[PDB]
Amino acid sequence: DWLKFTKTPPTKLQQADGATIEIVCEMMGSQVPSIQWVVGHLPRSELDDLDAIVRVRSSHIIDHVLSEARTYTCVGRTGSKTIYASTVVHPPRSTPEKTYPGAQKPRIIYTEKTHLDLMGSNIQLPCRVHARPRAEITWLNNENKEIVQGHRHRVLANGDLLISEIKWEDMGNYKCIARNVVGKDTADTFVYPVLN
Amino acid sequence: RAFEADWLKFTKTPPTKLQQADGATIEIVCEMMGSQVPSIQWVVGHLPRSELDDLDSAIVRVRSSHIIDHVLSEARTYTCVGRTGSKTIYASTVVHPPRSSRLTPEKTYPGAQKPRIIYTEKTHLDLMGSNIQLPCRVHARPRAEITWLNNENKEIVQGHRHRVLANGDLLISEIKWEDMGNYKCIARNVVGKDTADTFVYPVLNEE
Amino acid sequence: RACGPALMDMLRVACPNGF
Amino acid sequence: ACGPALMDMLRVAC
Amino acid sequence: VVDSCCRNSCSFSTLRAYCD
Amino acid sequence: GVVDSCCRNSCSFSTLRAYC
Numbered sequence: 001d002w003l004k005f006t007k008t009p010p011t012k013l014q015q016a017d018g019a020t021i022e023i024v025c026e027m028m029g030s031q032v033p034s035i036q037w038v039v040g041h042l043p044r045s046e047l048d049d050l051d052a053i054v055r056v057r058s059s060h061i062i063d064h065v066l067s068e069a070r071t072y073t074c075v076g077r078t079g080s081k082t083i084y085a086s087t088v089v090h091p092p093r094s095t096p097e098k099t100y101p102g103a104q105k106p107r108i109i110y111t112e113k114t115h116l117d118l119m120g121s122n123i124q125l126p127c128r129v130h131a132r133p134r135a136e137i138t139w140l141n142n143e144n145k146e147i148v149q150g151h152r153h154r155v156l157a158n159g160d161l162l163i164s165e166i167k168w169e170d171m172g173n174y175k176c177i178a179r180n181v182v183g184k185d186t187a188d189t190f191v192y193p194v195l196n
Numbered sequence: 197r198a199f200e201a202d203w204l205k206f207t208k209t210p211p212t213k214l215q216q217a218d219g220a221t222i223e224i225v226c227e228m229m230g231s232q233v234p235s236i237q238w239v240v241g242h243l244p245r246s247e248l249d250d251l252d253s254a255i256v257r258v259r260s261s262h263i264i265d266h267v268l269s270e271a272r273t274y275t276c277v278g279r280t281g282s283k284t285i286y287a288s289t290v291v292h293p294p295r296s297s298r299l300t301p302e303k304t305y306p307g308a309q310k311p312r313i314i315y316t317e318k319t320h321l322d323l324m325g326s327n328i329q330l331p332c333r334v335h336a337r338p339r340a341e342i343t344w345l346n347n348e349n350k351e352i353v354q355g356h357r358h359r360v361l362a363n364g365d366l367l368i369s370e371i372k373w374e375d376m377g378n379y380k381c382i383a384r385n386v387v388g389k390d391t392a393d394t395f396v397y398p399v400l401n402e403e
Numbered sequence: 404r405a406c407g408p409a410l411m412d413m414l415r416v417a418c419p420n421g422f
Numbered sequence: 423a424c425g426p427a428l429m430d431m432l433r434v435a436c
Numbered sequence: 437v438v439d440s441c442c443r444n445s446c447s448f449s450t451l452r453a454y455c456d
Numbered sequence: 457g458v459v460d461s462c463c464r465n466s467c468s469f470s471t472l473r474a475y476c
Binding site: 032037038039040042043044045046047048049050051060061064067097098099109110122124127128129130131132133134135137151156157158159178 | 233238239240241243244245247249250251252262263264265266269281302304311314315327329332333334335336337339340341342356361362363364367383
């Protein structure tokens with residue numbers, strides 16, 4: 001099995017006072033890899049659950065001014081393989097450590113850009129928003145109609161959409177719409193079901 | 197609601213200091229109870245502000261444990277973060293490395309690993325007709341395989357209502373009272389097994 | 404039935420004051 | 423419709 | 437309590453009444 | 457012209473890799 005960065009977070013950044021920085025790291029690899037973020041210098045510590053192709057993107061939102069430089073490592077994991085990149089964010093030269101205040105726009109911080117699988121196999125595309133207040137997830141489909149919980153499909157507790165026993169009709173561009181009072185964010189997960 | 201209450205309380209509190217007995221495997225446990233489905237998250241180090249999601253009924257008691265399987269080069273602080281809705285609590289453990297070692301520091305113990313279930317729900321209370329997702333999260337090398345047992349103790353089969361996901365989570369739908377009981381997660385790999393029971397109680401109604 | 408002291412256990416954490 | 427995906431997929435996969 | 441609830445379903449309201 | 461053939465069928469895997 002393989003794993004490669006398709007998008008890599010920059011190795012150094014400079015913060016700007018009053019600004020909100022979103023670090024973005026994405027990868028493509030076999031059998032649903034999973035991206036995870038951790039801050040600080042760590043050698044090789046381990047997490048978090050040990051129980052087809054997929055391209056998955058995930059981002060980290062720095063929404064409060066830094067008091068010292070920090071490193072954010074984005075960790076990719078599928079099966080035996082494991083890959084990592086780090087970004088070091090310098091604080092600006094000009095309240096630090098205080099999350100910016102009041103309503104914030106949704107930003108979708110975890111989605112899958114492209115998903116390939118074999119028919120008859122159940123797939124679960126994820127939408128993890130980061131937004132204040134807490135946003136609402138509505139799922140569009142391949143022909144852009146709101147999802148109905150038919151038991152064909154189910155939108156889960158976490159916003160993840162579960163498409164059971166995929167078939168050809170199902171192939172296409174699925175979209176996640178996260179909305180709160182101060183705006184929206186949207187992301188499309190392709191789906192392509194290959195056959196045995 | 198509302199402005200609260202949304203609550204969160206520590207059922208099992210990680211100890212403030214541990215000593216890593218040489219070539220030990222230390223598993224730190226924090227367990228907490230509160231409204232909604234809380235989430236436990238682990239991070240190492242001292243941090244000010246923090247970042248979990250964020251994509252926002254029921255009362256849940258959740259357990260989560262962190263497994264250190266390698267000898268430490270220096271002291272380390274392991275912090276467990278709990279966040280349901282707008283609440284957040286955290287507890288911290290500082291784990292001293294042993295005085296002397298015959299092992300390489302910061303090298304994961306090599307070998308087979310018996311499964312450890314690291315993330316389970318001890319008690320799950322939600323209203324009838326609500327859908328629940330119970331978790332089993334294992335930390336076993338080789339990779340373990342999850343079998344779920346219901347209150348009767350009969351194995352679980354894919355169907356309407358009960359359904360077992362890729363994550364190992366068991367998802368029960370449009371719950372009735374017929375479902376009330378104790379549910380068991382068996383995680384088994386080539387070297388052994390560990391087990392978890394998730395008490396569930398559907399509440400009613402209103403009606 | 405099965406709930407038994409599961410409830411008792413839950414309540415002691417759950418309320419302000421426990422039994 | 424699906425046109426771009428495979429090419430976009432294509433570069434990465436091989 | 438247990439007898440009150442376990443034998444039949446209990447309301448969220450009903451459970452609170454039990455709290456001391 | 458992968459899309460025209462492979463997408464349309466649509467193809468499965470090894471066929472896709474063959475393209476690539």
